[PDB]
Design a protein around this ligand. Structure first.
Ligand SMILES: [Mg+2]
Ligand SMILES: [Mg+2]
Ligand SMILES: [Mg+2]
Ligand SMILES: [Mg+2]
Ligand SMILES: [Mg+2]
Ligand SMILES: [Mg+2]
Ligand SMILES: [Mg+2]
Ligand SMILES: [Mg+2]
Ligand SMILES: [Mg+2]
Ligand SMILES: [Mg+2]
Ligand SMILES: [Mg+2]
Ligand SMILES: [Mg+2]
Ligand SMILES: [Mg+2]
Ligand SMILES: [Mg+2]
Ligand SMILES: [Mg+2]
Ligand SMILES: [Mg+2]
Ligand SMILES: [Mg+2]
Ligand SMILES: [Mg+2]
Ligand SMILES: [Mg+2]
Ligand SMILES: [Mg+2]
Ligand SMILES: [Mg+2]
Ligand SMILES: [Mg+2]
Ligand SMILES: [Mg+2]
Ligand SMILES: [Mg+2]
Ligand SMILES: [Mg+2]
Ligand SMILES: [Mg+2]
Ligand SMILES: [Mg+2]
Ligand SMILES: [Mg+2]
Ligand SMILES: [Mg+2]
Ligand SMILES: [Mg+2]
Ligand SMILES: [Mg+2]
Ligand SMILES: [Mg+2]
Ligand SMILES: [Mg+2]
Ligand SMILES: [Mg+2]
Ligand SMILES: [Mg+2]
Ligand SMILES: [Mg+2]
Ligand SMILES: [Mg+2]
Ligand SMILES: [Mg+2]
Ligand SMILES: [Mg+2]
Ligand SMILES: [Mg+2]
Ligand SMILES: [Mg+2]
Ligand SMILES: [Mg+2]
Ligand SMILES: [Mg+2]
Ligand SMILES: [Mg+2]
Ligand SMILES: [Mg+2]
Ligand SMILES: [Mg+2]
Ligand SMILES: [Mg+2]
Ligand SMILES: [Mg+2]
Ligand SMILES: [Mg+2]
Ligand SMILES: [Mg+2]
Lengths: 67, 60, 144, 185
RNA sequence: GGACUUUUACUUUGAAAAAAUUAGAGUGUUCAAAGCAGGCGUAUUGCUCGAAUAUAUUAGCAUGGAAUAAUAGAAUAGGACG
RNA sequence: GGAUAGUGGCCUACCAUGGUUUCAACGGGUAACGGGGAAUAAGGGUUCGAUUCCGGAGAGGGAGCCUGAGAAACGGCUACCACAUCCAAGGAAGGCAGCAGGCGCGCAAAUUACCCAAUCCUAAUUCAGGGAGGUAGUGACAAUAAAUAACGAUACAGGGCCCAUUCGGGUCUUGUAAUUGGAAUGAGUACAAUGUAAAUACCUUAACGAGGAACAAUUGGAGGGCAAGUCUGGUGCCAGCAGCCGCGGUAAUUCCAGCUCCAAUAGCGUAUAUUAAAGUUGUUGCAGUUAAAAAGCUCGUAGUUGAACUUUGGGCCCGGUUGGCCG
């Protein structure tokens, strides 16, 4: 079996030059898991329709519960 | 010419030929081995030579 | 040196003369006139699917004596009406009026086949299930 | 929008569909070398024809022409390298000669039989295709390998399978398991 | 640097010339269609071959040829040299 | 002169009468985007190119324009035209010839999946984003390699062969065999590790996994062209076959089947087109007395074509590249 190998001069140099899927692969980094791809996108697209902080629109919509 | 001829008899002969079902027979080899079979049948040990040669004769 | 101009600068005359006489070639003329697209029941396409109007019994030509079991079909892209043969013993049992059949050519560049007078097509499928499979009985016609 | 992964086909198909002579000769060729297709013959005659063609095109050039020398030689040293072209007749007019059998004789199919090791072109097929025999420690299982002359010396059964040590194989080990389970305990 | 020059066709060689395609060299993708790899050791601290060549025409450019084909010249000499 | 980033009838003012055309202008057709290219292999050709690269054009149809270095932009606006959505009837919103996915059309074409790991691209930027692009799914589009079996023994049968006065079998095997014999292997299934962004497959490989009831090859064909029956049963100018010539009306070599057989074989038939065959488009390379085809005749312009002749002959030098006889 023919492969390829890298050996770094330190372990900080490996952690800082290595693809983060190999650090995951070995045992040197967690796999910070996130939403689906189109999930994050949909969150962005939601978030484009709001201009400003957003809590101001909760309080302005809070006034819509009355009338 | 004629375009409105009878249509009842469509399918006649197939419908009145007697069903004979196939017969269960030795499995013939597939691929290279069949070619081998052809080679030894056509050339190696030969068959008849009644005048010349034949391949699918009945009674002769 | 009969006919053709032999000279070294008469390439114009030779080209044109060829152009003109290509037109006497029946298939160059067809291709250039667009007959395919203009006449012809298919679009120029290889096949065409239509609807069965009526079931015909065409009497064959001489010196043959048969009844040739066909179908008049109206093409879905044209509404053009076309009388098409139903090949193999039976099969006219398989069609029925208003059914949806896939007509193909007869393999004679236009032109009717054998003794079937003026039939330039043949049925390949009914109801999306192909004569051949039905005739042998590999398939069975759809519900309706 | 990616580079076209290019391809071509490897056989041609006879102009005359039903020629008894050509069908006889072709068949003998399949039963002599243990081929399964007329394609296995067509493919090789396709190679022969592209060779013969280049050979003719080169032969029409002037002798000592730079291309004729460069490409002609490469083709000749190539045909010698595998075992189709003899050392004696090593100057492209024999490559213009040549024939299909000279190509057929060089297959790993036919070689594994040729120095014993099989004693049937068909036993040769089944052996090769079944992962036995190799060149280096490199197993090959393609009947049309074509034995590269200087690897003729390395045609042996492979480190694995029977016939070359390592194991009998799950057939025989099942039978040895039937003896050890029935006769003893 | 100054002063002027009858016009062409043909052919030769050469420049300018994308890649993939075709033709084709090298390389054993296990074979093959392919791909442009790969091959050597001290296989514990590197060594190294490559990634060619061909076609690429008609037009334009650039050089050699002077056969074959045209073209212009001096006859109211308003001709040529000084 | 104005206008443009700038040349220009690009535009305006004045002035003139010019420009193109049988060497085919102008107009019409194109089921026309152009090229690199593709299919067909004596050559000359013929046909094709919506489509992986380059150039152009468009973003439902037109026009207009803002921003800007750059757009006459459409995943920008503005107006009209054609579509068309939501509503509380006041109004408001949409432009898949991006990715997938739907309807329609049809002979005719796949997942509303995963990822930025790679190739590269953009920004303020190593990091963020990318339906570019990559991964899998669908996928007999074309292309590659090539399992469906291999080997003994036995029962006669031989063909051999030495001998033959004559049983004959015995060695060297040719194989048709209705009992046999142990061998081999991935198709599949599946620890593991490899793979990968994560997966899935491949390449590896523990445990499994072939005897006919499989893990069981097909598609056409068997009168001719054209490779394979004059077998049996059926039908009886019917039903049907038949590219073509032709088969079928009672012993059908073409139909319907059974048997056997042929060809190609994980592929084979059909239809449409086209290329070859086609020297049936003929430049190479056709034909025109009677087979298709010299205009009733002569003039004649465009066009094509067009007799011979002008430094030929001799002399000298220079240096190359093959080949010989020697090295
Ligand atoms: Mg995101
Ligand atoms: Mg934001
Ligand atoms: Mg005419
Ligand atoms: Mg006609
Ligand atoms: Mg009618
Ligand atoms: Mg193994
Ligand atoms: Mg040149
Ligand atoms: Mg200007
Ligand atoms: Mg005027
Ligand atoms: Mg005028
Ligand atoms: Mg004209
Ligand atoms: Mg168009
Ligand atoms: Mg075109
Ligand atoms: Mg194009
Ligand atoms: Mg189109
Ligand atoms: Mg330009
Ligand atoms: Mg649209
Ligand atoms: Mg726009
Ligand atoms: Mg855009
Ligand atoms: Mg309009
Ligand atoms: Mg209201
Ligand atoms: Mg879409
Ligand atoms: Mg869009
Ligand atoms: Mg997009
Ligand atoms: Mg399809
Ligand atoms: Mg779809
Ligand atoms: Mg990326
Ligand atoms: Mg994507
Ligand atoms: Mg994409
Ligand atoms: Mg699949
Ligand atoms: Mg099978
Ligand atoms: Mg097994
Ligand atoms: Mg089995
Ligand atoms: Mg069959
Ligand atoms: Mg025959
Ligand atoms: Mg007739
Ligand atoms: Mg009969
Ligand atoms: Mg027949
Ligand atoms: Mg029959
Ligand atoms: Mg074929
Ligand atoms: Mg020819
Ligand atoms: Mg003709
Ligand atoms: Mg010529
Ligand atoms: Mg010739
Ligand atoms: Mg003729
Ligand atoms: Mg006449
Ligand atoms: Mg006359
Ligand atoms: Mg006249
Ligand atoms: Mg002359
Ligand atoms: Mg001289």
């Amino acid at each position: 079996s023919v492969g390829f190998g890298l050996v770094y001069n330190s372990v900080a140099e490996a952690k800082k030059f290595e693809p983060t899927y190999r650090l995951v692969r070995y045992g040197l980094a967690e796999k910070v898991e996130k939403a689906s791809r189109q999930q994050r996108k949909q969150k962005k697209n939601r978030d484009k329709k709001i201009f400003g902080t957003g809590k101001r629109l909760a309080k302005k919509v809070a006034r819509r519960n009355a009338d | 010419a004629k375009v409105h001829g009878s249509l009842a008899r469509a399918g006649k002969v197939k419908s009145q030929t007697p069903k004979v079902e196939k017969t269960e027979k030795p499995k013939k080899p597939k691929g290279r081995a069949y070619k081998r079979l052809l080679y030894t049948r056509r050339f190696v040990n030969v068959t008849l030579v009644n005048g010349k040669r034949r391949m699918n004769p009945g009674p002769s | 040196g009969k006919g053709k101009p032999r000279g070294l600068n008469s390439a114009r005359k030779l080209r044109v003369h060829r152009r003109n006489n290509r037109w006497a070639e029946n298939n160059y003329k067809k291709r250039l006139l667009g007959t395919a697209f203009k006449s012809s029941p298919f679009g120029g396409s290889s096949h065409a699917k239509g609807i069965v109007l009526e079931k015909l019994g065409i009497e064959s030509k001489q010196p043959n004596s048969a009844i040739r079991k066909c179908v008049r079909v109206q093409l879905i892209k044209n509404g053009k009406k076309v009388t098409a043969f139903v090949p193999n013993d039976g099969c006219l049992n398989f069609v029925d009026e208003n059914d949806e059949v896939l007509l193909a050519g007869f393999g004679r560049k236009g032109k009717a086949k054998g003794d079937i007078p003026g039939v330039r097509f043949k049925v390949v499928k009914v109801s999306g299930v192909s004569l051949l499979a039905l005739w042998k009985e590999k398939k069975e016609k759809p519900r309706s | 929008p990616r580079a076209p992964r290019t391809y071509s086909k490897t056989y041609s198909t006879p102009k005359r569909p039903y020629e008894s002579s050509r069908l006889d000769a072709e068949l003998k060729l399949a039963g002599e070398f243990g081929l399964k297709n007329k394609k296995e013959i067509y493919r090789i005659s396709f190679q022969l024809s592209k060779i013969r063609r280049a050979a003719r095109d080169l032969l029409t050039r002037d002798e000592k022409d730079p291309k004729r020398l460069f490409e002609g030689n490469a083709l000749i040293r190539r045909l010698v390298r595998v075992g189709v072209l003899s050392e004696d007749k090593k100057k492209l007019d024999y490559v213009l000669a040549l024939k299909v059998e000279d190509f057929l004789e060089r297959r790993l199919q036919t070689q594994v039989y040729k120095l014993g090791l099989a004693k049937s072109v068909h036993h040769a097929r089944v052996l090769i295709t079944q992962r036995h025999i190799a060149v280096g420690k490199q197993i090959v299982n393609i009947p049309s390998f074509m034995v590269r002359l200087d690897s003729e010396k390395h045609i042996d059964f492979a480190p694995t399978s029977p016939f070359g040590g390592a194991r009998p194989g799950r057939v025989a080990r099942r039978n040895a398991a039937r003896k050890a389970e029935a006769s003893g305990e």
